Design a protein around this nucleic acid. Structure first.
Ligand SMILES: [Cl-]
Length: 276
DNA sequence: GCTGATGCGGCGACGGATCC
DNA sequence: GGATCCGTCGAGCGCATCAGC
């Protein structure tokens, strides 16, 4: 079935208007995404904060266009030190964060270019490009050990300020989160191990899945489609991209959007509206 | 400098069997 | 004998390195 994201709900359960718009996009090659006009789409979305994943771009290679975003002028970038051309994340913000850090505890020795932490007045934002389990699950054990390290890391942060985690978490949590659950149960992104890791992330930190919280029974809502086999035109997809929130932020939650129509990557943007 | 091949990382279509 | 299950295979894209010029 095709999918039509419902209209933007811009007011919280208590009637407060949204004051903060966060957009997250796994761009699958930041320089190619720009050439495919992804920044034109960002401009129309006008987020306060833009998180980008799979940029595949070290900071010296950022296109000039990123220097022409006056409403997203505070920019933080990360890319892995060995595997240049892979992973890579970015966080761009209208207002300057109070603190920024990289990685999940030892980035200075294992510069992975997967995680950015930014602390604002009212919340801490984490964006992540979570390690894929690999074709044939060759890196699944690593993914499980990464999941555990990440959970512990985030539990520490959320003990201080409320947490917003966004990005490509690279698992479809439940069967409703992908088009072909039965055929993919031995594939990266839908193994029992990865699904369990996501469930434990929600329980241990604790975090809520903003979109599923608002739309608990809505199927065919995906954020990724393989480039092969015309999967996007058929909406044969996976929901890999999330906004997870501390429970205490749920009264600020206005809406969590899937921007299905925005092209330029094999993932689409997702957008969060918060009343802070 | 530039192009294009190759390497590497990030699953749905289809054929055949099985279920009742 | 239509629906479902299951395993196999052939498959887009981006960016790095490498060869060639
Ligand atoms: Cl990558």
């Amino acid at each position: 079935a095709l999918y039509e994201d419902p209209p933007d709900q811009k007011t919280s359960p208590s009637g407060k208007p949204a004051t903060l718009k966060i957009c997250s996009w796994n761009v699958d090659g930041l320089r190619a995404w720009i050439k495919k006009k992804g920044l034109d789409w960002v401009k129309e979305e006008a987020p306060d904060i833009l998180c980008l994943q799979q940029t595949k771009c070290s900071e010296n290679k950022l296109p000039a266009e990123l220097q022409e975003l006056p409403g997203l002028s505070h920019q933080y970038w990360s890319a892995p030190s060995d595997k240049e051309g892979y992973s890579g994340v970015g966080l761009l913000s209208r207002q300057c964060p109070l603190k920024v850090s990289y990685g999940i505890g030892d980035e200075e020795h294992d510069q992975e270019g997967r995680v950015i932490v930014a602390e604002f007045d009212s919340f801490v934002l984490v964006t992540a490009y979570v390690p894929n389990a690999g074709r044939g699950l060759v890196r699944l054990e690593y993914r499980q050990r990464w999941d555990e390290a990440f959970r512990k890391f985030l539990k520490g942060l959320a003990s201080r300020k409320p947490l917003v985690l966004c990005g490509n978490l690279n698992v479809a949590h439940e069967e409703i989160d992908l088009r072909n659950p039965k055929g993919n149960k031995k594939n990266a992104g839908f193994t029992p191990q990865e699904r369990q890791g996501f469930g434990e992330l929600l329980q241990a930190v604790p975090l809520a899945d903003s979109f599923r919280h608002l739309y608990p029974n809505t199927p065919y809502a995906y954020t990724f489609w393989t480039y092969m086999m015309n999967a996007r035109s058929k909406n044969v997809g996976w929901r890999l991209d999330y906004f997870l929130l501390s429970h205490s932020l749920l009264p600020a939650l206005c809406d969590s959007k899937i921007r299905s129509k925005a092209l330029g990557s094999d993932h689409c943007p997702i957008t969060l509206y918060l009343a802070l």
